[PDB]
C-alpha cells in the first residue's frame, strides 16, 4: 500500500481536478475516464 506513496498521493491530488471537471458533464464519472486506459 505504501510503495510509491508520495508519487501516488501527488497523482491522486492531480487527478481529483480531472474528476471534478468531468462531473460537470456526466452524471456518473468512470475510472476509465479518469486514469484507467480503456481504448477502442
Amino acid at each position: 500500500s505504501l510503495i510509491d506513496n508520495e508519487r501516488i498521493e501527488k497523482r491522486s491530488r492531480e487527478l481529483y481536478e480531472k474528476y471534478r471537471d468531468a462531473k460537470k458533464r456526466s452524471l456518473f464519472v468512470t475510472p476509465m475516464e479518469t486514469w484507467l486506459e480503456v481504448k477502442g
Binding site: 491522486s12 474528476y19 462531473k23 452524471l27 456518473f28 464519472v29 484507467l36 480503456v38 477502442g40
Partner: protein, 82 residues
Amino acid sequence: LCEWGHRAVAPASIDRQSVCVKFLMDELSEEKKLPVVIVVDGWNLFSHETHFRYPHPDFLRGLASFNESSTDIDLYPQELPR
C-alpha cells in the same frame, strides 16, 4: 463529508464514495490530537488478500470482432492473481 459521500443517488454514489473515503482517511491520518480507536473484525482478511481478481486485459484493451484476435475470454476461464 461522510453525509455527502454516502447520501447520493446511484450510480453517482459509486464515484462519490471513493473520493469521500480517500479524503476521510487523509484527514484522519492528519489528525494528531483526538484518540481514535479502530476496531476491525477479522484483520487477517484485510492483511492477506481479497477473493476478487484483476480483470483480464482484453476487457480493457478493447476489441473489434471476436474471431479476429482469437481471444479465449469467453472460451476458457482463467485465474488472474488475487
